[PDB]
Amino acid sequence: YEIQRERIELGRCIGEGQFGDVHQGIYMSPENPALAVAIKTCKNCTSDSVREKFLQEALTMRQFDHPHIVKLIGVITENPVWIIMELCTLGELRSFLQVRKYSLDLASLILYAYQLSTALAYLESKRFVHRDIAARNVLVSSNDCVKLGDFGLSRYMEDSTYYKAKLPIKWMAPESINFRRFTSASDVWMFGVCMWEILMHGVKPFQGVKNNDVIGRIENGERLPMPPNCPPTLYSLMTKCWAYDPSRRPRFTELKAQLSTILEEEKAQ
């Protein structure tokens, strides 16, 4: 899993991470075609405690191998420490959705929700609780492929460090907001919010509502409204993710199967 720095061509900065800037680049793989990659850099990895924390993020991604989760390519443990990830060429999902708005076919939006449900069913199969499922952590590899982004770079995951700028209340299950309970069932609640975000073309949930007012509305039975053009079967599926009792929420394998049916019904106009 070690990569040699002379095989990396560093390109433009595509974002800022907790440990340092993230760049786009090219990895000249030995005896293979060159790959487009994302490079996580570390500014203070001279410190052993910082270096080990940064390298733990690469080990977290190394344990996963799924077509809709960004893949670890390798690490450069020489000073300055770099983590090499696969690049999702088209960038962040919210920006991509905000450009296209109604020009994206409904079949593409449902496909994105289905692809994420396969990655979340895979994480659930490994007994891994995400805790930060939101459209901001989703990347676009091509017009017909989205992926979950790096877990370390995700602002509110369990082992993620904080950025200079507390909790994503508008995405969280009631038991997570009230008692900090995070399970596979609370991940299902967040995924229903993420599906709503996709069908709303990158609009954020509960805009203009204060975080403290969200739990009162949820306890009164209020939910995010049906997005314009969203098929009623898809909205019904979202409301099942938002069952107040977590034991009544479906698991990711069921959401995957139902989304595949919804997608095939839309493709048959």
Ligand SMILES: CN(c1ncccc1CNc1nc(Nc2ccc3c(c2)CCC(=O)N3)ncc1C(F)(F)F)S(C)(=O)=O
């Ligand atoms: C949102 N995220 C970030 N948060 C903080 C820092 C960086 C990232 C993005 N990280 C990544 N970005 C890309 N692709 C990419 C992203 C942006 C742009 C472009 C390509 C080109 C067009 C453009 O203009 N910008 N692929 C892979 C990664 C990964 F492997 F590092 F995850 S996250 C939690 O990692 O999903």
Ligand code: NA
């Ligand atoms: Na190296």
